[PDB]
Amino acid sequence: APSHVPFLLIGGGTAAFAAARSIRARDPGARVLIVSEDPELPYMRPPLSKELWFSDDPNVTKTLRFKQWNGKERSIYFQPPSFYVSAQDLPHIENGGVAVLTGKKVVQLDVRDNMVKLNDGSQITYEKCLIATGGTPRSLSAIDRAGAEVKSRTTLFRKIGDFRSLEKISREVKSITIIGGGFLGSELACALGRKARALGTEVIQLFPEKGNMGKILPEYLSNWTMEKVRREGVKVMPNAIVQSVGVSSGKLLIKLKDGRKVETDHIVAAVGLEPNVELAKTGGLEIDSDFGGFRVNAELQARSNIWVAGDAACFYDIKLGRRRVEHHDHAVVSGRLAGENMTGAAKPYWHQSMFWSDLGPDVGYVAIGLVDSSLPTVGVFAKATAQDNPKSATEQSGTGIRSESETESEYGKGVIFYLRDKVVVGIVLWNIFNRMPIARKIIKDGEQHEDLNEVAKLFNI
Ligand SMILES: Cc1cc2nc3c(=O)[nH]c(=O)nc-3n(C[C@H](O)[C@H](O)[C@H](O)COP(=O)(O)OP(=O)(O)OC[C@H]3O[C@@H](n4cnc5c(N)ncnc54)[C@H](O)[C@@H]3O)c2cc1C
C-alpha cells in the first residue's frame, strides 16, 4: 500500500486497464497503480452475460476461461496475474510497472492536495490521476421497499460474483425472473433460457415496453427480438409495470399494475446504471446533469491532472455534443486516449463509440450514435447469408469482442437509420458486420438524404 504513486487509476475495470497499457507503451518505465474495490483483477464484462453461459466446461465457473463463438478459449481477465507488479514494489522496482490494489475503495479525493483516502485509512498521493469508476446498477423502488427478504433474492447483474451466484441459482431453483427489457436483460434472458431448457426450469423476462429493447429499436425489430427470446423458452411479458414485490410461502410474488401476478424463485434486475460520481463531492468536479457523469474537456480532463474515461465520463461527442455511454468500445478507446494524454498529451477524443450485443452465436446487433426509438426511423432488411451472424464474425476476426474486429477508424439482417430531419444521427445494424467504418463515415458527414436505399447498399443489403 504505497504512500505515493505517479499515476493513480481509481477503479479497476476496462477504462482503467486501457489507460495503464497505454501509459506503459508510451513510458516503458512508468509507475501506475490501480485501486479496485473488486477482489478480482481487471476483467471485461461482455462475457458475463454471453459466452460464459454457453460453454460445456463444468469448470467454467472457476477458471472463467470461456469459449468464444468460433471455439477459441479466452480468459475474462485482461492480463495474466503475472504481468502486474505489487503495490509494494511499485514505488521503487526497476522499470516500474502496473499494480492493482484489490479489495480497496477510494472514498475521498482531495484535488487541491493531489491525494486520495482509501476505506481502511490509507492515504495515497498522486502526480496524475484517472477516475475510471464505471457505474452502479439501478434497482427499482418497488423492490427496495419490500424489505431485506426480497432484496436478498435480487441479483443486480454486473460482476463475476453475480455470474457465479446466478449460475449456481439456475441449478437450484425452478423459476428465475428478469426485470428489464434492455440488451443486458435480453442477453440474460437467452443465456438463462438455454440453461433452463436443459434442466426443465422456467425463465421469465418482463418490462414496461411493448417489446424487448423498446427504447432503442422500432416495433418491427423489437417484436422480432421478443419472438427470438420466446423461441429460447422464455416467458416474455411485455407491458409489465411492477406494482410491488413480496414473499408468499417461499416464493417471490410479483404484482403488476395491469393486474397480473407472477410466482418466481429469484429475480435478476437489468434496468440500467447510475454513474459513480461518489468522489465527485469531496473533489469538487461535481458532474453535469443532462446526461450524468463527470464533466471532461476534449482531451478527457476534469482538472489539469485528473482525467476521466469509460462509463463515468460525460464527454463531448464529435457529432452529438455532450454524451454518456455504457459501451465497452468507449471504455477501451477513451481509456487508451486518457493514458496517452497522461503521458503528454494534446490529443482530442474524436471517436464514435460503437455498441454491440449478441443474443447467442446466431443473432447480433450493433449500434452507433443516437439510437432512440422515438425518433424518425427508416429500416431496410434482407435475407441473411452464411457470414451474416456473430459466429461468422468471430470466426472471421478470431475475436468475439466486436470493437476489436470492426475497427476504430472510418428477413435475417438489416439497417435502421435514426433521423433529425433528414440527417442520420444514429444507426443500428442487425446481423450486419464489417460495416462500422461506413456506418461512422455516414453519421460524421452529417449529410442530408432523401433516399436511404442507396446508402443501405454500401452495407451490402
Ligand atoms: C454484464 C455486462 C455485459 C455487458 N456487455 C456489453 C456488450 O456486449 N457490449 C458493450 O459495448 N458493452 C457491454 N457492457 C458495458 C461495458 O462493459 C462497460 O462500458 C464497461 O465495463 C465500462 O468500463 P468502466 O471502466 O467504465 O467500468 P467498470 O468496468 O465497471 O469498472 C469500474 C470498476 O471500478 C470499481 N470502482 C468504482 N468506484 C470505485 C472506487 N471509489 N474505488 C475503487 N474502485 C471503484 C468498480 O467496482 C468497477 O470494478 C456490459 C456490461 C455489463 C455489466
Side-chain angles (χ1 to χ4, degrees):
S3 85
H4 182 266
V5 61
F7 306 98
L8 178 73
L9 281 36
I10 306 176
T14 304
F17 182 81
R21 204 229 288 102
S22 195
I23 300 186
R24 296 287 289 166
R26 284 185 55 97
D27 180 3
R31 305 185 187 274
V32 183
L33 167 83
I34 302 166
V35 197
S36 178
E37 68 173 356
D38 225 45
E40 334 278 343
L41 301 168
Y43 63 88
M44 59 196 100
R45 307 267 207 261
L48 294 166
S49 56
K50 284 192 209 33
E51 290 90 341
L52 275 175
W53 295 88
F54 277 74
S55 89
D56 287 306
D57 190 342
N59 273 299
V60 77
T61 250
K62 308 187 196 185
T63 66
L64 317 159
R65 179 161 284 272
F66 64 95
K67 286 188 166 174
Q68 287 160 340
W69 300 136
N70 68 332
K72 288 299 156 209
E73 284 213 334
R74 180 177 170 166
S75 175
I76 195 165
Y77 296 106
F78 283 120
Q79 264 191 149
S82 60
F83 287 24
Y84 298 97
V85 288
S86 31
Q88 275 87 11
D89 297 352
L90 187 61
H92 46 71
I93 191 154
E94 174 85 347
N95 286 22
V98 194
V100 193
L101 254 171
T102 57
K104 299 298 158 185
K105 193 198 190 184
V106 183
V107 286
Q108 207 170 81
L109 183 85
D110 186 356
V111 295
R112 279 276 158 180
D113 283 285
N114 287 6
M115 182 209 275
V116 294
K117 218 168 164 80
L118 300 199
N119 52 292
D120 59 8
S122 291
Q123 307 198 158
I124 309 162
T125 71
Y126 56 84
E127 305 171 26
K128 287 167 197 167
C129 184
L130 170 78
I131 300 169
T133 53
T136 279
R138 260 202 224 98
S139 181
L140 282 177
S141 51
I143 307 157
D144 290 283
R145 105 228 330 170
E149 259 296 319
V150 167
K151 190 194 166 184
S152 69
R153 296 168 87 177
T154 309
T155 313
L156 310 145
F157 203 84
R158 191 127 179 97
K159 296 178 301 303
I160 291 167
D162 301 312
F163 176 72
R164 281 165 173 165
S165 67
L166 183 64
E167 191 282 323
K168 189 161 175 288
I169 275 144
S170 91
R171 284 180 292 113
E172 291 163 332
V173 307
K174 308 280 182 183
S175 189
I176 297 176
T177 298
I178 293 146
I179 307 200
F183 292 93
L184 174 49
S186 298
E187 287 175 343
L188 275 176
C190 293
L192 283 166
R194 171 196 156 110
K195 297 247 169 275
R197 189 163 68 261
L199 304 185
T201 49
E202 175 182 40
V203 182
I204 289 150
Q205 181 192 13
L206 55 87
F207 44 87
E209 297 88 36
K210 283 188 277 288
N212 296 56
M213 290 89 82
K215 299 166 170 321
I216 284 97
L217 302 176
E219 265 149 69
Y220 171 68
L221 190 56
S222 161
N223 187 264
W224 184 93
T225 299
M226 178 151 72
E227 277 149 20
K228 176 70 186 196
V229 188
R230 279 166 174 172
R231 289 188 198 223
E232 305 293 8
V234 179
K235 280 196 199 67
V236 186
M237 312 175 83
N239 322 112
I241 326 279
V242 191
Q243 193 71 274
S244 66
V245 185
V247 174
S248 184
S249 81
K251 307 292 277 271
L252 302 164
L253 178 64
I254 297 165
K255 293 182 178 198
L256 309 169
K257 296 207 175 211
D258 58 84
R260 295 178 290 179
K261 290 180 284 161
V262 168
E263 296 184 37
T264 208
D265 286 290
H266 197 90
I267 283 151
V268 189
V271 301
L273 58 71
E274 205 102 36
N276 278 330
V277 296
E278 209 117 8
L279 326 169
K281 156 160 70 257
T282 46
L285 300 144
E286 296 169 67
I287 104 246
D288 83 288
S289 68
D290 312 339
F291 295 101
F294 300 95
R295 287 206 76 104
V296 288
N297 62 0
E299 281 171 44
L300 300 166
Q301 301 177 297
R303 289 283 168 264
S304 69
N305 74 326
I306 312 174
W307 290 254
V308 186
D311 286 1
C314 181
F315 66 99
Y316 204 99
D317 189 302
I318 160 155
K319 261 283 152 196
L320 304 160
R322 227 192 347 204
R323 205 183 156 198
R324 188 174 68 77
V325 302
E326 277 131 276
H327 319 162
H328 184 262
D329 180 46
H330 181 238
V332 162
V333 184
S334 62
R336 203 168 77 245
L337 197 105
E340 289 160 347
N341 283 344
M342 282 164 64
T343 50
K347 265 165 63 183
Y349 187 54
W350 288 164
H351 193 258
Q352 282 185 318
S353 173
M354 64 161 285
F355 171 82
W356 90 98
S357 150
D358 300 349
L359 314 171
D362 301 346
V363 191
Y365 311 70
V366 173
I368 182 111
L370 177 61
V371 282
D372 181 2
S373 70
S374 59
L375 281 181
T377 48
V378 184
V380 183
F381 316 92
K383 292 179 179 179
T385 56
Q387 79 254 33
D388 303 331
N389 58 114
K391 186 163 177 175
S392 286
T394 293
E395 253 147 32
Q396 279 174 32
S397 64
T399 175
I401 303 289
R402 209 76 41 212
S403 45
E404 300 171 356
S405 70
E406 208 102 349
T407 309
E408 318 181 356
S409 59
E410 301 151 322
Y411 279 162
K413 63 187 181 189
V415 39
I416 299 155
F417 310 101
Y418 296 71
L419 308 164
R420 197 95 68 162
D421 294 32
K422 272 174 175 167
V423 194
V424 187
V425 295
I427 286 171
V428 172
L429 296 183
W430 174 52
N431 278 279
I432 295 161
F433 307 101
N434 298 333
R435 306 292 198 275
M436 191 48 70
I438 317 158
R440 286 195 180 98
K441 195 71 199 166
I442 284 155
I443 316 169
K444 197 258 281 197
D445 289 335
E447 286 270 316
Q448 286 174 110
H449 294 276
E450 294 233 10
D451 0 40
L452 278 193
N453 289 255
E454 297 294 298
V455 181
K457 286 203 163 193
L458 258 166
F459 295 108
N460 200 14
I461 291 285

